[PDB]
Amino acid sequence: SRIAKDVTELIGNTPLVYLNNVAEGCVGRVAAKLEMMEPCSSVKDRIGFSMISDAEKKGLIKPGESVLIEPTSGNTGVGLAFTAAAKGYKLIITMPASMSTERRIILLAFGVELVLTDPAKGMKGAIAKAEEILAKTPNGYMLQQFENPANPKIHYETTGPEIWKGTGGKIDGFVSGIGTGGTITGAGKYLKEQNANVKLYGVEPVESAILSGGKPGPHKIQGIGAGFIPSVLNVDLIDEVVQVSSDESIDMARQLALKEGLLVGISSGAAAAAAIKLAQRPENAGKLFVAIFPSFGERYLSTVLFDATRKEAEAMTFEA
Template sequence: MEVLNSYYPVLYRCPVVKLGGYAAQNRLRGEILAYLDFGGATGSAKDGLAESMLALATERGDLAPGQTVVEASSGTFGAALALACRVSGHPITLIVPRTLDAERMSYLRGLGAKLLYSSPLDGRRGMEQLARQTAESCGGYYMDYFANDDNPEHHRRVTGPAILKATGGQIDAVVAGVGSGGTVTGVGEHIRAWHDHIKIVAVEPYESQAIGGGFVGKHGIPGLGAGFVPANYNPYVVDLVMAVTSGDAQRAAREVLLTDGIPACPSAGAVLFAARQLIEKGKARRPLCIFSGRVTYD
């Protein structure tokens, strides 16, 4: 067995797995593949993404050694960025809603983040405004995850090529959830440059359909459905937008744990359920879904 000097090289070792148990359980006339992008330290695709975005900003000279990084996030990207900053020697300030639970606050502080609080009444836009002001006042670098092209660039360079290398292009759809829009945009742009036959499918919560132009509301799929169309979302590479209910996403996540032993989170369950629907409706026979996060069972 290989002995590694660091855990970080394995972040990009994301296997592609055939979900044979799930397909058999649901009697699907097709095959579902899953790209498991959740092997990092905080348990989501954001680990590799955060490291990549820091590296790209440093390469351009936008981020200096030891410079403070500022971001508006209390979710998986905030956690991944906090850890990546700690490892690379950058102080980090996260803008989080004042209503964030104490356990999450403690977790983010434990990763090295300084927390500043925004009013929940100001929403996402208020968090972003405070992040910009904070970066300006402290001379920091505002990561701006939802609009920074380094987000989809990571997926153009890493995720898209990895999927094509693993499958040889022998898939007929790639199914990705939309939160910041970086994954579906970056992967979609890379795959579209090489293969015309592969459909790019974007998935959002049924209860919050900003991408599809529908109503926006609360939902139970963390990481998807920001409630607005993010700047990083490129609609021109997306062939189909699918809406999945929170209940269907959660059930699919639980089911694939039992059938294939994969600890999928609800956002992974959403793309899995969408892939299942593609097969059932005759729109695909071998879709690949991107699992961007895992859930921990205590």
């Protein structure tokens, strides 16, 4: 074994674990890829690093000179933040002021120069502000997670190989919730190259199933269902799109903690619900499905994921 040079070398190589009691009724087999175990608890730690690293190698940016910028209210900000702190890059992040205080604290802790935007203008307002800052800032450099090729590329170079090796080449289906689409595109392409028969299942919200001809809409599956097809997403690789409801995902997320000891985010619940359904189809008896569990559940204590347990906690009194 050895000592890592810095935190960026601790990224990736996350474990696989079989789902047991929650997978009742499956004739197929489901293993979860735990991105929740990344140094900062989410799959985004991979692209936060890859987008910065790729820019560096291309000579497009330099530590202490370039100013990183990105409009993000989710895990991508965190992934970029810890990697920027380690490599010595100034990082500016824009997000709607409506975002919870906890989401701002974590970024601040890493030294991010946070810029909040009109809560009424949503992410559109955050994106406008970012571009406005880019125009102002001389050595500014926007990452653009939805457009950056380095996003799916890191998944093609690490995530995919890890899954192939971790399953001994026995994976039959890869189940991935789609946010930027980088994971399913990069890892999926790699897996397809190892065995053309491997099936790629993209997961999206029933309330915003745009890949299925649905119309964009609000949902609670944080991390997926952007409401549009991301530039980095390659829909040709997708063999089947599986829709899961917000309630399904929330319920599975809770069941995963209660029965598997896996405290996961709601998008992990979505991936699990999708994968479990597939593993229940008689035609898939004996097959091995790998579902990506994007993030750890602790980062979502204030969201709807814990509403039920939260009110119960708040309503209890001490026993003498």
